[PDB]
Design a protein around this ligand. Structure first.
Ligand SMILES: Nc1nc(Nc2ccc(S(N)(=O)=O)cc2)sc1C(=O)c1ccccc1[N+](=O)[O-]
Length: 294
């Protein structure tokens, strides 16, 4: 900590606190995540160093990893705003479609890259997507397969957002696939368009049921194997799928077609990041400059 001047706290998670800080030596401004433990997991710490090699324009750069004094510090390149704040600042007007499209395209490139390197994000949400004045957007705060005991109560405690969680996770799947990130990104795409969260559940069952109420209760026809999943109950209510044109108006058919493919129930039917990049929706993609108030 003596090597870093804390300028201000820029957030807090269940097991980590994030500060904007300055390197007393270099003068470089960074985001510093501080994580508290009785020796700390080497396995979890392992995966970390791995992320250091994942360098891509749409992935926040992990500069350094420091284990010391029973604390783990992650130092990342600093960006000035997250998508959650940007969406809130743009709620009255809405983000222009060309910017929505550019951000979606860039995030898919980022995912295409991590997925081809067998890296999953696992917890995409607007707060973990960072933007800069040049029109770029980047994936931040990648989640580990396991880096700390199943989070359920933080020091001061904070409510975990389930809004972007894929249905297979909610149904108890033990192994996540790259498809979980595509689902989360589709939820974010919908939110940028409508200016309302797609599935705002306040509990795991409410989250699951909100997804079911919109996309219809899944069955073996659309999702083979779903009725044998760990948390599936034959007692789940059976909702009919809602007309998709009601879900994200006034998004055009190209956008709606791509979103429907990102939200397929079956992880194996859900579009890949690579395939999504080739979807007709991106035929006219460009890279606009966002109006950012910092
Ligand atoms: N790199 C980086 N930059 C940031 N700046 C920032 C500046 C302003 C705002 S805001 N609310 O719009 O004013 C938000 C973020 S956060 C961040 C992260 O890498 C990060 C992102 C999410 C969770 C945890 C971490 N983390 O582990 O450091």
């Amino acid at each position: 900590m003596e090597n870093f001047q804390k300028v201000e706290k820029i957030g807090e998670g269940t097991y980590g606190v994030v500060y904007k800080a300055r390197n007393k030596l270099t003068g470089e401004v960074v985001a510093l995540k501080k994580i508290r433990t009785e020796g700390v997991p080497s396995t979890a710490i392992r995966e970390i160093s791995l992320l250091k090699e994942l360098n891509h324009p749409n992935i926040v750069k992990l500069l350094d990893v420091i284990h010391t004094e029973n604390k783990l510090y992650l130092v990342f390149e600093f960006l000035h705003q997250d998508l959650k704040k940007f969406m809130d600042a743009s709620a009255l007007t809405g983000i222009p479609l060309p910017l929505i499209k550019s951000y979606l395209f860039q995030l898919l490139q980022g995912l295409a890259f991590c997925h081809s390197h067998r890296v999953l994000h696992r917890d995409l949400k607007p707060q973990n997507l960072l933007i800069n004045t040049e029109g770029a957007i980047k994936l931040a705060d990648f989640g580990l397969a396991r880096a700390f005991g199943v989070p359920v109560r933080t020091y001061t405690h904070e409510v975990v957002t389930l809004w972007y969680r894929a249905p297979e996770i909610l149904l108890g799947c033990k192994y996540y696939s790259t498809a979980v990130d595509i689902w989360s990104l589709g939820c974010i795409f919908a939110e940028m368009v409508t200016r309302r969260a797609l599935f705002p559940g306040d509990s795991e069952i409410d989250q699951l049921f909100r997804i079911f109420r919109t996309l219809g209760t899944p069955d073996e026809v659309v999702w083979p194997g779903v009725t044998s999943m760990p948390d599936y109950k034959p007692s789940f209510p059976k909702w009919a799928r809602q007309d998709f044109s009601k879900v994200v108006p006034p998004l055009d058919e190209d956008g709606r077609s791509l979103l429907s493919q990102m939200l397929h129930y079956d992880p194996n039917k859900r579009i890949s990041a690579k395939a999504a990049l080739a979807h007709p929706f991106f035929q006219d993609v460009t890279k606009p400059v966002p109006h950012l108030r910092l």
